[PDB]
Nucleic acid binder design. Sequence first.
DNA 1: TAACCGCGTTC
DNA 2: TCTAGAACGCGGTTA
Length: 1118
Amino acid sequence: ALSAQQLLNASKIDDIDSMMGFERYVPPQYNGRFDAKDIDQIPGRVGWLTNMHATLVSQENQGISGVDFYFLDEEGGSFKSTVVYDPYFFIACNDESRVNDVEELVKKYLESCLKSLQIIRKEDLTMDNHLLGLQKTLIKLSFVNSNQLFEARKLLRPILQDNANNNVQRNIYNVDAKHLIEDIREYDVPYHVRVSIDKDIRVGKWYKVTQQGFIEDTRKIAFADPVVMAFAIATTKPPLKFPDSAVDQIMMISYMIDGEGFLITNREIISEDIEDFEYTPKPEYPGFFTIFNENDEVALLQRFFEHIRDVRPTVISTFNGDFFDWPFIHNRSKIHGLDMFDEIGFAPDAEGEYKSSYCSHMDCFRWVKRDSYLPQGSQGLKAVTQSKLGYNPIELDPELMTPYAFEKPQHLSEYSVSDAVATYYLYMKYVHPFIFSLCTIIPLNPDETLRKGTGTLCEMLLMVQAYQHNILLPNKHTDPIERFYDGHLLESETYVGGHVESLEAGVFRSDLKNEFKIDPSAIDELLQELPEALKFSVEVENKSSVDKVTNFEEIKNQITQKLLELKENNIRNELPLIYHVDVASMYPNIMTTNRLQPDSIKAERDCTCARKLKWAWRGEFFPSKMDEYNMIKRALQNETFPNKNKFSKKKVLTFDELSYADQVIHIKKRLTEYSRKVYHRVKVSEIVEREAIVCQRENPFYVDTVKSFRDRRYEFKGLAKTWKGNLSKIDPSDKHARDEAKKMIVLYDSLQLAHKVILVSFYGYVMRKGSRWYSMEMAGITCLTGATIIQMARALVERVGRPLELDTDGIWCILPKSFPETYFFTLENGKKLYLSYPCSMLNYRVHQKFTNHQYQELKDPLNYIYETHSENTIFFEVDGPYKAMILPSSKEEGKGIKKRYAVFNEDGSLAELKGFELKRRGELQLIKNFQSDIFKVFLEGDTLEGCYSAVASVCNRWLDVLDSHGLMLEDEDLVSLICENRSMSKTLKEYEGQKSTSITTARRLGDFLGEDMVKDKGLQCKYIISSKPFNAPVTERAIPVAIFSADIPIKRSFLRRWTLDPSLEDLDIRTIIDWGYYRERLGSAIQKIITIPAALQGVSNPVPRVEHPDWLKRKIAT
DNA sequence: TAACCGCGTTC
DNA sequence: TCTAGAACGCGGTTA
Ligand SMILES: O=c1ccn([C@@H]2O[C@H](COP(=O)(O)OP(=O)(O)OP(=O)(O)O)[C@@H](O)[C@H]2O)c(=O)[nH]1
Ligand SMILES: [Ca+2]
Ligand SMILES: [Ca+2]
């Protein structure tokens, strides 16, 4: 009977919408049609589609499912329109010769909730002979609304459950319509996604609502201009503690409406009225802020709600507003007897996010986490503003925010508006164009397009294609509760992913010679391949004819000469070329090249239409054999287990009464212990080579969806490379032009990077839980192929140069300056073709060794005729040459360090900085600052020994800081440097049984500040390591730095018990710090970045105060 | 020592 | 309910 609540919400939403200018519009009647050819003559209204929501409508007894669509018109007004559409799923049969039987069974069995029945045909990619036109026969079950559809699923669950079970026991001497139901299908499609897909409607497009439906107005090009408001709030706060919406009250609310700034103040907390002021952190971001000082907090909550009602925003944007700002304003509204939904139409949703019917809530944080590609350390509003808006916003320590309401109130106003300027323009520059454009192709509304996982976005895109090609959707994948290998229970199953190598360490610089030993057979091969490789660079890499180039031979001769010189002088000590090569969209292009897609992976049971590809399976299993497993369970059955507290009338249940999941949880725990006793090992690992069949004839709907999105991405990655090149030839004097070029660059890279995460997710999606297109084989094939390609490239670079570091699809290397480099073909059109020889020599080899010659495509669909061709879309790309590269080395002999290095441009600026602490969220501030100081110094010096000598100067300076027990440092700089901040992904309660510095810090912080400091997840534990108790585990000597900001009685009490020293009177933070700990951690960074690499390049220890690992001293001593 | 865990990276 | 993947570094505990 839940329809009541739903039908109620519909009326509430209807009146809220009408208050905000969204009245239900019904188009005039029209007999005939010009069928979208002359829309101007069909009566109705034109609007820009800005939102959509599933609703329930009435006849105008049960509700009628429909979708509301919210439009902005061309006359400055708004309106909504409603489409009704019967929900439906399918029933499949195990014998299509009796489909009519099931029809009469379900017609009567589901008669309580069924509206209509119908037999339809779709294409099943899991059905034999489906490539010849055979189709699966199905019964389409339609309903008046989604509640009825659900009742049908409930009534149908037994039939499917019993049929999977065996038959009952009647006349054992004897030797049906229910068992004809094999499965239900397409039952879990969100209703509004279903309407968007079946009706081809998309938010962000222009339509004309007519009686015969929405007609797309392909003439309108640009988006409408929705009213857009972004807001932030500031609240009071107990010292060292978190805001409490039950106690703490809202001090101010700053916001921005279409570029106008406003600030509301609670004068009961703000010491004085605020005057209108301007914060324009850069000319591109204006900000004139009008003030609304109000008497009490309630007055502030009521002006905000009224201002919102007046301006009518169809977009409201925040930064983490879903889990801080909105629930604060909501609780403060409740306390003061105010109802947020009746005032502004906003309320929490089933996930606790704050949503509205007429207005999308665009929480910019969600874009940052999903689409920005920023490291976690740079995902705060400050770091984002620096990266994406190009300026430093106002920063105020939060402990100073409550008092500065009284002492320095205008300052606290400026910070408040600073967060509002940054949020508004972050939205309009980055989030608004991306999300509203993405809605034009993905069938979600703006709120869901912003928030859903990128694997789900992929699934949305894939479902559109499958529907439009009349392909029946597979049900969501479900992996089994137990898997077995060679009789062992498996703990983990996966494939071998990317191939990573650390090959050299140390400093490499464009002005410092290096020794190269060049393989003469390599130059022989390159010389043999050269005429065709250059023909490949022209014809394939540049889509042009060799007949229209006019300097082919001159380039062939010039390249050949340098090659022949390298073959005669194999040994050389020259200046290096620090180059990088990476395959563009490697896994997508491997997939599209090999025509990889989950429906294409066949067993011997079905199906040269077949291309065999190899992958590497890796399993992790217990060493226990099934004999031991069966024993462990039986024991568990004889034991007794507690019960869920429904009633607690029965307070014990047997093992076999536990859910199958909870059963194996106990089996798993018990089995780990048995293996540790009888085997002394818990998990065993094994890799197996596997070969899968990839049909090259399968319906390529998945492969083609990937191609489309890759090409969609390539647009922006190419505009990015264009505008980057423009900025190369803008006169340094022309500031405005250079500023505009850079702005274009940062936008297009952001757009290409946001498309990147969806693109790569088309690969991850085949391994995602709940995937409608799951295939481990396809993922494992993708990876092994990529490992084979990059290792082929490494083999060649090895023989003509020195590869430095290698990761999945990319190689950093140095090559002799004398190696053939960059050339420019010339055409009769006067145009030039770029050529980088090191890129093309690889690409000609990739296309020689990894092209799919068995690619097949339907040429004549009516007669089912296929035409085979060759396909290869895999290409390395080149960037460089660079001024410097710095690769660290491990403290452990023979090992490398992967995924960490610094790279510098010729202009001296940082090109890349991968992996290091400096960039990761948290870590120990000292190591962060030391790293930031050291990397630029590697460019100084005139020789390899002087470069290291210069860096060494910075080290010994940093060492003096800690050898002096922090005496050379003021207190402010001391707390910052020696602190370490770590994050707790869950709450402390869920870490029970584990020891960590974050765990210890959380516990101590809870005892001192109360339990309410642990209640939530994501807690930031800021600690220092104390000297005492001496020789104790570091996890036991971890003090939260908040104690040092507490009252002396508190400080001594906790510091005494934390150090196990009840005589402690001396609370100076300097005396508590375990300086030998930090001295060793700083020293450990120094070895890996400076001293041990220097040794590997034959340079005596530049920092003698950091002693070499014993193994190195021995090797040094030969 | 080697296995193993939580976090946050590079792909 | 909703949910892209594997390989790796590093401080830290534990067999
Ligand atoms: O977030 C990510 C990044 C990378 N990857 C995986 O790493 C592979 C190589 O990582 P890359 O960063 O090189 O990505 P890419 O080749 O797809 O894109 P561009 O170089 O053109 O910028 C990708 O093909 C993908 O499979 C992910 O799965 N997820
Ligand atoms: Ca790249
Ligand atoms: Ca790549």
